[PDB]
Design a protein around this ligand. Structure first.
Ligand code: HC4
Length: 125
């Protein structure tokens, strides 16, 4: 188990050292997106929450293909403003309900340290 707490102030520095195997040891769901919303990384805890198979969703677009319930001003709209501005750090509750039992989660979106990548972190509430 990797010990990093959800919501930690310097989480992007800590997660910069992990490969996909290490990300699978986190206590919470983690998705890495490019600035178009394509999925680059998707960990085991996220798949436990959503039912998706991690290897199968890498390369898909999160907003168009995987998670249409997030294509809303309340989720996608926040992401796209962050990508446009080059800064993003926001936490909110949301319900995931596409092809699954409706599940309430806490979401933390934060710009990654390097380049044009963005984290989505998720835990149950
Ligand atoms: C709504 O369509 C949410 C879907 C969803 C959220 C997060 C995931 O990792 C996968 C699907």
């Amino acid at each position: 188990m990797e010990h990093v707490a959800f919501g930690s102030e310097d989480i992007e520095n800590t997660l910069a050292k992990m490969d996909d195997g290490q990300l699978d040891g986190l206590a919470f769901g983690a998705i890495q997106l490019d600035g178009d919303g394509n999925i680059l990384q998707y960990n085991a805890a996220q798949g436990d929450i959503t039912g998706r198979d991690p290897k199968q969703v890498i390369g898909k677009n999160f907003f168009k293909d995987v998670a249409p319930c997030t294509d809303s001003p309340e989720f996608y709209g926040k992401f796209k403003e962050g990508v446009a501005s080059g800064n993003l750090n926001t936490m909110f509750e949301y319900t995931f309900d596409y092809q699954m039992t409706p599940t309430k989660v806490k979401v933390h979106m934060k710009k990654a340290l390097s380049g044009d990548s963005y984290w989505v972190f998720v835990k149950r509430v």
